[PDB]
Design a protein around this ligand. Structure first.
Ligand SMILES: CC1CCN(c2ccc(N)cc2Cl)CC1
Length: 282
């Protein structure tokens, strides 16, 4: 079926939970043996969220190459993403090592450091220009260059230096600051405006490594971001845009990381975002 009328049909029939459970039942199951090794217990934020072996990002380090991060490679859309958990106190150096080694330009953050009175991720970037951060375990230096605070999101320019080679690179940090502590946004308008700002920066383009995107576990809000982006790109590329099937795209992405889209409300919000976004594209 088309999207906007399939949407109204699920609303009127109140069957979002059944649609979402079907997706959970059909989703791929692949091994995640490296994630479950005992030496990696303190590298995982949640015991039930792990990267598959076949798609995990490997750190270029012979001691322990493990990080909780996955490469999502969308063949028809010609778009790749790295989805990862919010960094832990003991994995902030690994996080920036990954950014460096994978040649990413942009980092997309969809959570606040504290939500619901608990820490959802480490303070992994510097908050003042004159107070830079040094990660001694991976030999990197990170400096805040500029910060632009808007009503729904903040953009930061960061400088990452490989201290071993003295090479430097500019990284763009896109921070969506207004996702509610519970549920999903009432309108997709600010999320779509945010998605277009990331696009306009060049961070998603093939001339760079894959964008790094995260929330707390790296599957819910993060899944919503890449699902909406890929579906809108396919609607632009194809002769028949009504042939884009959001459920089929989500199952394809779940071949590369488990659990993408965590609730039936997030599924409904993803439909809403693609529907409204398709009108603005033209
Ligand atoms: C990193 C912290 C930074 C402050 N954030 C924040 C919260 C609410 C609004 N409106 C704006 C922002 Cl910038 C929460 C997480």
């Amino acid at each position: 079926m088309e999207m906007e009328k399939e949407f109204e049909q699920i609303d009127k029939s109140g069957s979002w939970a059944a649609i979402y459970q079907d997706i959970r039942h059909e989703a791929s199951d692949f091994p995640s043996r490296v994630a479950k090794l005992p030496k990696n217990k303190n590298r995982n934020r949640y015991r039930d969220v792990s990267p598959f072996d076949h798609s995990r990002i490997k750190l270029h380090q012979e001691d322990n190459d493990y990080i909780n991060a996955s490469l999502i490679k969308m063949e028809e859309a010609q778009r790749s993403y790295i989805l990862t958990q919010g960094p832990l106190p003991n994995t902030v150096g690994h996080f920036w090592e990954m950014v460096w080694e994978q040649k990413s330009r942009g980092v997309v953050m969809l959570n606040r450091v504290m939500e619901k009175g608990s820490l959802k991720c480490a303070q992994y970037w510097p908050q003042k220009e004159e107070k830079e951060m040094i990660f001694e375990d991976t030999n990197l230096k990170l400096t805040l260059i500029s910060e632009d605070i808007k009503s729904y999101y903040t953009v930061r320019q960061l400088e990452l230096e490989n201290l071993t080679t003295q090479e430097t690179r500019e990284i763009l940090h896109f921070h969506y600051t207004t996702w509610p502590d519970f549920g999903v946004p009432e309108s997709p308008a600010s999320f779509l405006n945010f998605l277009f700002k990331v696009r306009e920066s060049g961070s998603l383009s093939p001339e760079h490594g894959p964008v790094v995107v995260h929330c707390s576990a790296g599957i819910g809000r993060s899944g919503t971001f890449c699902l909406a982006d890929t579906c809108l790109l396919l609607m632009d590329k194809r002769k028949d845009p009504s042939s884009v099937d959001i459920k089929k795209v989500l199952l394809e992405m779940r071949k590369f990381r488990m659990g993408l889209i965590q609730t039936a409300d997030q599924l409904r919000f993803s439909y809403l975002a693609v529907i409204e976004g398709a009108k603005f594209i033209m």
